[PDB]
């Protein structure tokens, strides 16, 4: 696979397992994982821009 990491046995260097989840360092605030902060109706007066 592209950018595929594998689990490598540290003695003899044999492929232990295909590792999933290709490299994503510092993606923390990316994909926020909690949305509900304000709703669609509580804006008011900006209908054309919406």
């Amino acid at each position: 696979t592209p950018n595929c990491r594998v689990a490598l046995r540290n003695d003899s260097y044999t492929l232990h397992k295909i590792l999933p989840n290709k490299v994503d360092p510092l993606v923390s605030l990316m994909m926020v994982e909690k949305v509900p902060d304000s709703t669609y109706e509580m804006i008011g007066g900006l209908d054309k821009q919406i």
Binding site: A7, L8, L19, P20, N21, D24, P25, V27, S28
Partner: protein, 70 residues
């Protein structure tokens, strides 16, 4: 023997731990962590830690030799 098991699980963590940072979680009880020695690793993790503290990122404690999450 059940009390021998809980003791030996308990005294694997009171040690001079090294500190790396949690990187990614594959599945149940195994994950990717990168040390602050460099040289990113892939080790087993415990059954003690509630898994909701490993969000993408946390400084974590690691054994020297077995290198597992502690």
């Amino acid at each position: 023997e059940f009390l021998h098991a809980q003791e030996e699980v308990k005294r694997i963590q009171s040690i001079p731990l090294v500190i790396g940072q949690f990187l990614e979680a594959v599945d149940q009880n195994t994950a990717i962590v990168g040390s602050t020695t460099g040289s990113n690793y892939y080790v087993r993790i415990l059954s003690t830690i509630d898994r909701e503290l490993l969000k993408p990122n946390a400084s974590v404690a690691l054994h020297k030799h077995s290198n597992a999450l502690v």
